[PDB]
Amino acid sequence: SMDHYKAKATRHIFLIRHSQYHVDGSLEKDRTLTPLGREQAELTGLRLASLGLKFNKIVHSSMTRAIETTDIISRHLPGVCKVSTDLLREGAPEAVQYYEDGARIEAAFRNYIHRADARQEEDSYEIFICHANVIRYIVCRALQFPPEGWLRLSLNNGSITHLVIRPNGRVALRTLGDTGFMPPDKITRS
Amino acid sequence: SMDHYKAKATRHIFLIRHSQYHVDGSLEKDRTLTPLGREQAELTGLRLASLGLKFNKIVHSSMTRAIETTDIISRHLPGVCKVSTDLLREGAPIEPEAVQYYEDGARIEAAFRNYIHRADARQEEDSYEIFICHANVIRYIVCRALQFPPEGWLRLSLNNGSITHLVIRPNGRVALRTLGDTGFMPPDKITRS
């Protein structure tokens, strides 16, 4: 169980990886989703809406692929409120930047996963639209797995990862990197 | 990842949990799939057939629930041989005497070493292998192959008929590509028991 964790209720955390995008955009402006990526986000959006859950929020960063993945999914989840955060931004001396980028991933974990809400009386269902690296960090961290193994988790574009966090901080992984709802010819990791 | 491992090509391991069944069945022969369980198995079969992979083999637990799940899945994978093994029968629950657990631990380790860790010197191309079994068996194999601690077993929750996909590189690096995938099943067909 996560240490120093008390919540009022159970929290269901859904971590969605960005869909495929033009990684060769000169400026962020240009790193939009590929046509395949747009279809992926659509499929992830239909899947999420089909769950019969009233989601509490969709948290995401300000990167072009993040905003675009979010926009598409969000149209399937009418009324669910969106929250922009730069703790989910993926960075782009070099060495000092990278340390800082890593520290931000931990802050993301701390701020959004390890921290529970006092207002929250009942079970919550929370979506986070993220880059691969923050998902796999969050998974290892919440599950108390060796952080050195985070890169052993291979997350498809648009995939859904579901963690369950009980009031006493016991955590269960119900699924990781699910793209079972996409036709196999639509699945990508880049 | 795995130590003392050198394979000639990549190995894709698909670990499939059995479909919903009659837990109340009085003998092992009575613990057959429910009608919903048979629908789940069908869905998993459809999904596996749709990946466009030539599966090398279907290795399955000899428990009735695992047999019936395999019967249904294998109809979608014509020409893939099926091999029954006692090594993949479910282990005693982690959440009941100690010699039972020693026995089960030893067997499931044997299963891991025989089916997951052992590279075939006759492999001549990338392989795709299906193992139809049980939650504790899969949890153990996943954690062992990824070097996750034994307290991780019970933190992994696998749906009935779910697909867990590991990729084993020739030098022994292991990636977890998906765990507990039932994303191909409508939510109103999804169960854990």
Numbering used by the authors:
A (entry chain B): -1 to 0, 90 to 179, 192 to 289
B (entry chain A): -1 to 0, 90 to 182, 192 to 289
Task: Provide the authors' original text about this structure.
To provide high-resolution details of the catalytic center, we also determined the high-resolution structure of ΔN90-PGAM5 in complex with phosphate. The β3-α3 loop was the region that showed the highest degree of flexibility with two major conformations observed, an opened form in the apo and off states and a closed form in the on state (root-mean-square deviation [RMSD] of ∼0.9 Å with an average Cα shift of ∼3.9 Å for residues 175–179). Binding of a phosphate ion induced a number of rearrangements in the active site resulting in two distinct on and off states, which were termed in relation to the “in” and “out” conformation of H105, respectively. In the on state, in addition to H105 all catalytic residues were observed to assume a potentially catalytically active position. This conformation was most likely induced by the closure of the β3-α3 loop which moved E177 inward, triggering an inward swing of H230. In a concerted manner, the “in” H230 likely forced an approximately 90° rotation of R152 side chain orienting perpendicular to H105 and planar to Y108 for cation-π stacking. In comparison, the stark difference of the off state of the enzyme was characterized by an “out” position of H105, rotating away from its catalytically competent position. This movement was likely a consequence of steric constraints created by R104 and R152 that retained their “vertical” conformations. Although this conformation maintained affinity for phosphate, the all-out rearrangement of the catalytic residues presumably depicted a catalytically incompetent state of the enzyme.
PGAM5 is a mitochondrial membrane protein that functions as an atypical Ser/Thr phosphatase and is a regulator of oxidative stress response, necroptosis, and autophagy. Phosphoglycerate mutase family member 5 (PGAM5) is a mitochondrial membrane protein that belongs to the phosphoglycerate mutase (PGAM) branch of the histidine acid phosphatase superfamily, known also as two-histidine phosphatase (2H-phosphatase). Despite harboring a canonical RHGE catalytic motif, PGAM5 lacks a typical phosphotransferase and/or phosphohydrolase activity for small metabolites, and displays instead a phosphatase function specific for Ser/Thr and, potentially, histidine residues (Takeda et al., 2009, Panda et al., 2016). Overall, the catalytic domain of PGAM5 adopted a classical phosphoglycerate mutase-like fold with the canonical three-layer sandwich topology, which featured a six-stranded β sheet flanked on both sides by α helices with the first four parallel strands arranged in an alternated β/α manner.
